[PDB]
Design an enzyme around this catalytic site. Structure first.
Site, PDB file in Angstrom:
ATOM      1  N   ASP A  43       0.836  -1.227   0.000  1.00  0.00           N
ATOM      2  CA  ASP A  43       0.000   0.000   0.000  1.00  0.00           C
ATOM      3  C   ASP A  43       0.855   1.255   0.000  1.00  0.00           C
ATOM      4  O   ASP A  43       1.330   1.725   1.029  1.00  0.00           O
ATOM      5  CB  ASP A  43      -0.862  -0.074   1.228  1.00  0.00           C
ATOM      6  CG  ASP A  43      -1.900   0.965   1.236  1.00  0.00           C
ATOM      7  OD1 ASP A  43      -1.842   1.832   0.312  1.00  0.00           O
ATOM      8  OD2 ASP A  43      -2.794   0.811   2.093  1.00  0.00           O
ATOM      9  N   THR A  44       0.965   1.872  -1.171  1.00  0.00           N
ATOM     10  CA  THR A  44       1.722   3.107  -1.294  1.00  0.00           C
ATOM     11  C   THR A  44       1.035   4.284  -0.617  1.00  0.00           C
ATOM     12  O   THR A  44       1.726   5.289  -0.399  1.00  0.00           O
ATOM     13  CB  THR A  44       1.982   3.424  -2.765  1.00  0.00           C
ATOM     14  OG1 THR A  44       0.751   3.568  -3.469  1.00  0.00           O
ATOM     15  CG2 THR A  44       2.835   2.372  -3.443  1.00  0.00           C
ATOM     16  N   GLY A  45      -0.252   4.188  -0.347  1.00  0.00           N
ATOM     17  CA  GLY A  45      -0.992   5.224   0.369  1.00  0.00           C
ATOM     18  C   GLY A  45      -0.870   5.141   1.879  1.00  0.00           C
ATOM     19  O   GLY A  45      -1.472   6.000   2.566  1.00  0.00           O
TER      20      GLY A  45
HETATM   21  C1  LIG Z   1       0.192   5.928   9.303  1.00  0.00           C
HETATM   22  O1  LIG Z   1       0.079   4.640   8.683  1.00  0.00           O
HETATM   23  C2  LIG Z   1      -1.121   4.312   8.126  1.00  0.00           C
HETATM   24  C3  LIG Z   1      -2.231   5.157   8.161  1.00  0.00           C
HETATM   25  C4  LIG Z   1      -3.394   4.792   7.494  1.00  0.00           C
HETATM   26  C5  LIG Z   1      -3.538   3.597   6.812  1.00  0.00           C
HETATM   27  S1  LIG Z   1      -4.901   3.297   5.893  1.00  0.00           S
HETATM   28  O2  LIG Z   1      -5.978   3.983   6.449  1.00  0.00           O
HETATM   29  O3  LIG Z   1      -4.999   1.911   5.708  1.00  0.00           O
HETATM   30  N1  LIG Z   1      -4.809   4.035   4.377  1.00  0.00           N
HETATM   31  C6  LIG Z   1      -4.444   5.477   4.301  1.00  0.00           C
HETATM   32  C7  LIG Z   1      -5.304   6.145   3.206  1.00  0.00           C
HETATM   33  C8  LIG Z   1      -6.835   6.037   3.414  1.00  0.00           C
HETATM   34  C9  LIG Z   1      -4.864   7.608   3.027  1.00  0.00           C
HETATM   35  C10 LIG Z   1      -4.166   3.200   3.294  1.00  0.00           C
HETATM   36  C11 LIG Z   1      -5.199   2.844   2.171  1.00  0.00           C
HETATM   37  O4  LIG Z   1      -4.525   2.337   1.088  1.00  0.00           O
HETATM   38  C12 LIG Z   1      -6.308   1.818   2.607  1.00  0.00           C
HETATM   39  C13 LIG Z   1      -5.764   0.406   2.918  1.00  0.00           C
HETATM   40  C14 LIG Z   1      -6.801  -0.529   3.422  1.00  0.00           C
HETATM   41  C15 LIG Z   1      -7.387  -0.319   4.656  1.00  0.00           C
HETATM   42  C16 LIG Z   1      -8.396  -1.155   5.090  1.00  0.00           C
HETATM   43  C17 LIG Z   1      -8.840  -2.208   4.302  1.00  0.00           C
HETATM   44  C18 LIG Z   1      -8.282  -2.440   3.058  1.00  0.00           C
HETATM   45  C19 LIG Z   1      -7.244  -1.588   2.607  1.00  0.00           C
HETATM   46  N2  LIG Z   1      -7.351   1.722   1.623  1.00  0.00           N
HETATM   47  C20 LIG Z   1      -8.605   2.075   1.856  1.00  0.00           C
HETATM   48  O5  LIG Z   1      -9.093   2.573   2.882  1.00  0.00           O
HETATM   49  O6  LIG Z   1      -9.473   1.788   0.803  1.00  0.00           O
HETATM   50  C21 LIG Z   1     -10.843   2.195   0.938  1.00  0.00           C
HETATM   51  C22 LIG Z   1     -10.928   3.711   0.819  1.00  0.00           C
HETATM   52  C23 LIG Z   1     -11.082   3.945  -0.691  1.00  0.00           C
HETATM   53  C24 LIG Z   1      -9.924   4.749  -1.189  1.00  0.00           C
HETATM   54  O7  LIG Z   1     -11.112   2.637  -1.284  1.00  0.00           O
HETATM   55  C25 LIG Z   1     -11.608   1.721  -0.284  1.00  0.00           C
HETATM   56  C26 LIG Z   1     -11.516   0.254  -0.749  1.00  0.00           C
HETATM   57  C27 LIG Z   1     -12.049  -0.785   0.272  1.00  0.00           C
HETATM   58  C28 LIG Z   1     -10.821  -1.059   1.062  1.00  0.00           C
HETATM   59  C29 LIG Z   1      -9.740  -1.106  -0.024  1.00  0.00           C
HETATM   60  O8  LIG Z   1     -10.102  -0.203  -1.057  1.00  0.00           O
HETATM   61  C30 LIG Z   1      -2.417   2.789   6.780  1.00  0.00           C
HETATM   62  C31 LIG Z   1      -1.221   3.119   7.453  1.00  0.00           C
END
Ligand SMILES: COc1ccc(S(=O)(=O)N(CC(C)C)C[C@@H](O)[C@H](Cc2ccccc2)NC(=O)O[C@H]2C[C@@H](C)O[C@H]2[C@@H]2CCCO2)cc1
Ligand SMILES: [Cl-]
Ligand SMILES: [Cl-]
Ligand SMILES: [Cl-]
Ligand SMILES: [Cl-]
Ligand code: NA
Ligand code: NA
Lengths: 99, 99
Positions: free
Chosen positions: B25-27
Site C-alpha cells: 500500500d503506497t498510500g
Molecule cells: C500511518 O500509517 C497508516 C495510516 C493509514 C492507513 S490506511 O488507512 O490503511 N490508508 C491510508 C489512506 C486512506 C490515506 C491506506 C489505504 O490504502 C487503505 C488500505 C486498506 C485499509 C483497510 C482495508 C483495506 C485496505 N485503503 C482504503 O481505505 O481503501 C478504501 C478507501 C477507498 C480509497 O477505497 C476503499 C476500498 C475498500 C478497502 C480497499 O479499497 C495505513 C497506514
C-alpha cells in the site's frame, strides 16, 4: 516516471476543471476526492477502511488527468481526509509496483 | 517483480514464523497488522484512515519478510481489516511506483 516511496507519492491531477493534489494509492480499490461538484448522475455508496466507513457520491465515466496522463472511470466524492487515486485509475495510466 | 494493479497487490509475509497475506500500500505511511503476538515493548500511536482515527500498538525493530525480501522495522498492531505493508517497509524492500 519512477516514484520512490521515501515520501508520500503525491501528484497533480485535473478533475472537473480543477487542479488538485492526490495520493497514488495501491491499497485503494477506488478513487476518492474531497467534496466538489461533478457533472451527470450519481448514486450513494459506503466505503470503508481504517476507522470505519464514510458515505460518498459515486460518479461514473469521469475523466481525470493524473500527472499528465488521461484516464476515465468511476470517481467517489465525499469527506475523505486526502484525495486518493486508487487502482481503478492507476491501471489506466499503466502504473506498476516494482521491486 | 513488476506488479500490476488490476487486482489487489497481495503478497505473502512472514512475521513471528507465521505466514500471512498483506496488501502492498503506497498510500499507507506505516505498516499495520491484525492482532497478533510480537516480542518486546510497544508504544502508543493514533493512525487516521478513511473512516477516522484508531489506536494501535507500535512495535519497533520487528523482523518481517515481505514477498521473500527481508525487512526489520516498525509494525503497528490493531484493528485493521487487512494486513497493510506501508512505505516504511516498502522502502526497505526497494519498491517504487512506475508509469
Ligand atoms: C500511518 O500509517 C497508516 C495510516 C493509514 C492507513 S490506511 O488507512 O490503511 N490508508 C491510508 C489512506 C486512506 C490515506 C491506506 C489505504 O490504502 C487503505 C488500505 C486498506 C485499509 C483497510 C482495508 C483495506 C485496505 N485503503 C482504503 O481505505 O481503501 C478504501 C478507501 C477507498 C480509497 O477505497 C476503499 C476500498 C475498500 C478497502 C480497499 O479499497 C495505513 C497506514
Ligand atoms: Cl511525506
Ligand atoms: Cl472505474
Ligand atoms: Cl497492464
Ligand atoms: Cl496517520
Ligand atoms: Na457519469
Ligand atoms: Na521492539
Amino acid at each position: 516516471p519512477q516514484i520512490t516511496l521515501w515520501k508520500r507519492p503525491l501528484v497533480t491531477i485535473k478533475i472537473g476543471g480543477q487542479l488538485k493534489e492526490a495520493l497514488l494509492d495501491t491499497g485503494a480499490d477506488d478513487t476518492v476526492i474531497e467534496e466538489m461538484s461533478l457533472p451527470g448522475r450519481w448514486k450513494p455508496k459506503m466505503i470503508g477502511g481504517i476507522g470505519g466507513f464514510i458515505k460518498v457520491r459515486q460518479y461514473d465515466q469521469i475523466i481525470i488527468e493524473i500527472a499528465g496522463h488521461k484516464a476515465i472511470g468511476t470517481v467517489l466524492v465525499g469527506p475523505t481526509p486526502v484525495n486518493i487515486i486508487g487502482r481503478n485509475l492507476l491501471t489506466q495510466i499503466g502504473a506498476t509496483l516494482n521491486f
